[PDB]
Design a protein around this nucleic acid. Structure first.
Ligand SMILES: [K+]
Ligand SMILES: [K+]
Ligand SMILES: [K+]
Ligand SMILES: [Mg+2]
Ligand SMILES: [Mg+2]
Ligand SMILES: [Mg+2]
Ligand SMILES: [Mg+2]
Ligand SMILES: [Mg+2]
Ligand SMILES: [Mg+2]
Ligand SMILES: [Mg+2]
Ligand SMILES: [Mg+2]
Ligand SMILES: [Mg+2]
Ligand SMILES: [Mg+2]
Ligand SMILES: [Mg+2]
Ligand SMILES: [Mg+2]
Ligand SMILES: [Mg+2]
Ligand SMILES: [Mg+2]
Ligand SMILES: [Mg+2]
Ligand SMILES: [Mg+2]
Ligand SMILES: [Mg+2]
Ligand SMILES: [Mg+2]
Ligand SMILES: [Mg+2]
Ligand SMILES: [Mg+2]
Ligand SMILES: [Mg+2]
Ligand SMILES: [Mg+2]
Ligand SMILES: [Mg+2]
Ligand SMILES: [Mg+2]
Lengths: 62, 133, 98, 183, 138, 63
RNA sequence: AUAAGCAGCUCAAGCAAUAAGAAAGCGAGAGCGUACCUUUUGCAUAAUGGGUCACCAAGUUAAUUUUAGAUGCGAGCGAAU
RNA sequence: GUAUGUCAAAAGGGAAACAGCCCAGAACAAGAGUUAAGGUUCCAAAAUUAUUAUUAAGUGAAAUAAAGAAAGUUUUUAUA
RNA sequence: CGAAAAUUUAACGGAUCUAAAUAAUAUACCGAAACCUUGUCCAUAUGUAACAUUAGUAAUAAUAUUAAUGUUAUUUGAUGGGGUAGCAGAACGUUGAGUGAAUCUUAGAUUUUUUUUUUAUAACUAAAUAUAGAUGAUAACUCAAGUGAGAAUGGU
């Protein structure tokens, strides 16, 4: 898909970006949800990651 | 077969006796006013024919001369006339390009059309003698 | 308004004639569907409702063929051609009195 | 194609037709009974017929691009038949793009300066296609106020009998019966 | 009996429900004819689009191959003579004249098998220097 | 016009009135003397030899 | 040199090859057709941009993280020995 | 706001010209082909087609100006 | 009649119409890129036969068959066909590279043109002009992109 190479190719003028928005002029942050607070803030993070546990290599009898 | 009308059996010799005759053959329902020797260029590629094949036309709407004119209600009876043609081959047209476009839209869609046509040659057009019928 | 929707207030004898034939053609569609069911001893609630509360072209008055009720008009009447899709829609009965 | 192959000399020739604006016309009259009530062809109904001849549309070889029209000599245009009060209430207008220079004139006042022939040329001119052949066709309409005209020798004939004459139909049927004596 | 339903009008500006009634009937394009039994379920399906279709009772149902044969015009010609053609998958077909009646198709890996005149046949015709037409024929 | 088909319709001229009166359930020979000049190959009866059997009364007298 | 064409399309007289054969082109006349792009609910718009032509001129590379198809191996795979 | 459709993103026919209305959804040609809306004297394809009344004002004929006046005219119902 | 506005008759499209107006009816005809018929193009299925290439398996000292891909025809007389934002698939062309120490060229390679033919963003035939044996051109398949411009008051 080579964009910007004519109308018949299917990606000629705007290259599948739309028409004069923030997503056409610049870039939108990935973590941005329009301003609404994310769930990890309204709920918070749960638990901790155990950094001292041993990573055993399991082996079964079968 | 249905017997020919008595009025047609008495005036056909006068029709076949005049100098010139014409006929309106019907190929696939479409008419073509032709005369012996004319070159008909059909607007389609007749399938299953090669240059040199003889066709026997049997659907004549009107067969007439200067003064008289024979007309069959659906079509003129086949036993009255005998029209034959010979396939002169196939002919093509120059490629024509149609550009489908709308205002304020850059996309121009092209349609390339190049049709073939079958050319016939009316080599026989005579009126039969119905003295026996 | 400055936008011109040139629609005459009345129909022409050519429009009225086609209207008569459309009201007459829908009568043949219901008569064929009703007679076909009667032969089998059947009935359809929609066909029984049409024949009960809708007249035929031969029973309609001229003012019911080319006009409709419109409470916004001076005499509560409006050209039937001023109805959306009036050519492909059924409209034969108006409020009583109007 | 054979239908067209031949001598098209006479198919494109200019025929000089003739009509009197006072003779009753059973075909172009709205009154068709009794016989004594039949009127001549009205202005617009006569112009509609002439415009068809000037366009050659009465011919089986008519083409809008080819100027295959014919001539039409109209006489007795002074007695042009009109209905209602058109003669005194109809108005013709004019303007030369200069504001205030709107020229108006009634039918009767226009028939005093240029006669009834000018009223018929305006009717035929509006019924002709608005293109580069409008002035050539309208020039083939020779309208006169009385029965006199310089084309009494040009009018199409058939065996010495001018068309529209008392016995012109008999002279035509006699020439065709002689043409049947050939193969 | 059956209903011979033919779509006389379109529904380009009618509600969406009207298209669902035409789709259930099977009328996709204009002037298309479909056959449905005479039943209350199909009858009520036509009362909704009665302003667009033309109904008619018929004794039996016409097959798909029989509905298109009533609008087919007569060919108006009959091939009475054919020339020698080469069929890609069947071989050379000799000339045939139907007026005097024979489609014979000869195939092979040698020119002689095809049934055409080869260079060998043209040399024997040239060596027959004794053949002569009858005196009366000249 | 815009297409060659639309032009053909606007420039249409119907056939002669005699051809429109097509028979129904039968074939007939109608007499249609055209309004045209006959060629020279329609020899008049005065130039036909006495032996030529084609000599015959006018076609009008046959109907 | 009597005429109000985004100059194209449909119909088309006529002119056009010193010569056997061979008609590209131009076209009177009739009809249809109010450039393009951008931006807009909607533009022939008297909304935006371009005097013409040629050239230069815009989703690419890197790392990382995925999916699909194809294919190697297979409870192993890859890499390296 | 709600219901339905079209336009937007839909060309073509009709509405004189026309984004939104009446029809109808354009893959390409051929046909006096068959039809929708709409129309048929001429411009301009097709009726100067038949039947019965009304209007005399070019009213009107494809964008209904009002209340109202009046020996305009016709019909009907009463009535002398 | 009521009914008067400023460029011009000025909202019958116009000519004109005593119907070619109006109301209540009947029939015929015209009428779209709609539908029909006869053909063509393209897309997507369903079987069959044949042609070619590639790679396998057999036969042959007195050719058959299997699979894939490409293509044509044909069976169900298969189905489908407007399009912006946008999504998806399949191709052509341009530049350079590999096969290439290959192929072709005064018996004319190459020549920015003209012309001709083929369902054709491309190539092809011929003609005219000039004259190269390779620092020339080149099919086919594949590889990689500084790869395609009537639009940026764009730049030279
Ligand atoms: K933009
Ligand atoms: K670029
Ligand atoms: K008026
Ligand atoms: Mg797109
Ligand atoms: Mg996108
Ligand atoms: Mg994308
Ligand atoms: Mg956006
Ligand atoms: Mg306005
Ligand atoms: Mg001049
Ligand atoms: Mg705005
Ligand atoms: Mg501008
Ligand atoms: Mg500027
Ligand atoms: Mg510059
Ligand atoms: Mg450069
Ligand atoms: Mg570049
Ligand atoms: Mg839609
Ligand atoms: Mg938008
Ligand atoms: Mg439209
Ligand atoms: Mg009109
Ligand atoms: Mg017709
Ligand atoms: Mg006409
Ligand atoms: Mg006016
Ligand atoms: Mg179609
Ligand atoms: Mg479509
Ligand atoms: Mg050169
Ligand atoms: Mg480089
Ligand atoms: Mg620029």
């Amino acid at each position: 898909i080579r964009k910007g190479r004519g109308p018949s190719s299917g990606y000629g003028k705007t290259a599948g970006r739309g028409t004069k928005g923030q997503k056409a002029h610049g870039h939108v942050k990935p973590w941005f949800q329009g301003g609404q607070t994310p769930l990890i803030v309204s709920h918070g993070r749960k638990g901790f990651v155990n950094q001292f546990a041993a990573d055993m290599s399991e082996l079964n009898l079968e | 077969q249905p017997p020919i009308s008595q009025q047609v059996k008495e005036l056909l010799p006068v029709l076949a006796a005049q100098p010139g005759h014409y006929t309106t053959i019907h190929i696939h329902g479409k008419p073509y006013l032709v005369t012996e020797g004319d070159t008909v260029k059909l607007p389609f590629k007749m399938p299953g024919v090669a240059p040199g094949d003889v066709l026997r036309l049997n659907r004549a709407s009107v067969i007439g001369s200067r003064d008289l004119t024979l007309q069959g209600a659906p079509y003129v009876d086949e036993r009255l006339f005998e029209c034959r043609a010979i396939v002169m081959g196939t002919e093509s047209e120059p490629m024509r390009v149609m550009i489908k476009k709308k205002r304020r839209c850059r996309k121009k869609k092209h349609v390339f059309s190049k049709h073939k046509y079958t050319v016939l040659r009316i080599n026989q057009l005579k009126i039969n003698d119905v003295s026996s019928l | 308004g400055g936008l011109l929707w040139k629609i005459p207030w009345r129909m022409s004898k050519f429009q009225k004639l086609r209207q008569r034939r459309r009201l007459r053609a829908v009568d043949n569609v219901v008569a064929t569907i009703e007679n076909a069911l009667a032969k089998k001893g059947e009935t359809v609630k929609a066909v029984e409702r049409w024949r009960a509360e809708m007249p035929t072209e031969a029973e309609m008055l001229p003012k019911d063929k080319y006009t409709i009720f419109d409470r916004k008009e001076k005499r509560y009447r409006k050209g039937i051609h001023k109805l959306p899709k009036w050519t492909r829609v059924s409209q034969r009965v108006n409020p009583p009195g109007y | 194609m054979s239908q067209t192959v031949g001598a098209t000399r006479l198919a494109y020739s200019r025929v000089w037709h003739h009509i009197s604006a006072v003779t009753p016309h059973p075909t172009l009259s709205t009154i068709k009974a009794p016989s004594e009530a039949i009127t001549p062809p009205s202005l617009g109904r006569l112009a509609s017929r002439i415009a068809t001849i000037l366009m050659g549309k009465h011919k089986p070889i008519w083409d809008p691009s080819t100027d295959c029209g014919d001539y039409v000599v109209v006489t007795n245009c002074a007695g042009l038949y009109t209905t209602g009060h058109k003669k005194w209430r109809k108005t013709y207008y004019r303007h030369n793009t200069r504001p205030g220079s709107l020229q108006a004139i009634t039918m009767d006042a226009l028939m005093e300066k240029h006669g009834g022939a000018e009223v018929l040329r305006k009717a035929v001119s509006g019924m002709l296609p608005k293109n580069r052949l409008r002035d050539k066709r309208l020039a083939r309409l020779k309208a006169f106020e009385g029965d006199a005209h310089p084309y009494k020798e040009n009018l199409v004939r058939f065996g010495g009998k001018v068309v529209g004459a008392p016995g012109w139909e008999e002279a035509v049927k006699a020439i065709r019966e002689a043409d049947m004596e050939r193969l | 009996s059956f209903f011979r339903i033919t779509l006389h009008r379109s529904a380009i500006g009618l509600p969406k429900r009207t298209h669902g009634v035409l789709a259930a009937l099977g009328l996709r394009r204009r002037n298309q004819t479909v056959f449905h039994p005479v039943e209350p379920q199909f009858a009520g399906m036509l009362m909704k689009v009665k302003e667009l279709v033309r109904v008619e009772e018929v004794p039996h149902r016409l097959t798909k191959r029989e509905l298109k044969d009533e609008r087919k015009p007569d060919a108006g010609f009959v091939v009475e003579k054919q020339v020698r053609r080469f069929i890609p998958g069947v071989g050379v077909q000799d000339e045939v004249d139907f007026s005097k009646v024979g489609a014979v198709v000869r195939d092979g890996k040698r020119a002689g098998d095809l049934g055409v005149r080869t260079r060998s046949d043209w040399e024997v015709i040239g060596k027959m220097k004794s053949v002569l037409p009858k005196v009366k024929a000249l | 016009q815009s297409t060659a088909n639309r032009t053909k319709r606007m420039l249409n001229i119907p056939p002669h009135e005699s051809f429109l009166n097509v028979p129904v359930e039968g074939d007939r020979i109608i007499f249609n003397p055209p309004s045209s000049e006959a060629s020279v190959y329609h020899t008049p009866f005065k130039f036909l030899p006495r032996s030529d059997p084609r000599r015959r009364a006018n076609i009008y007298k046959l109907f």
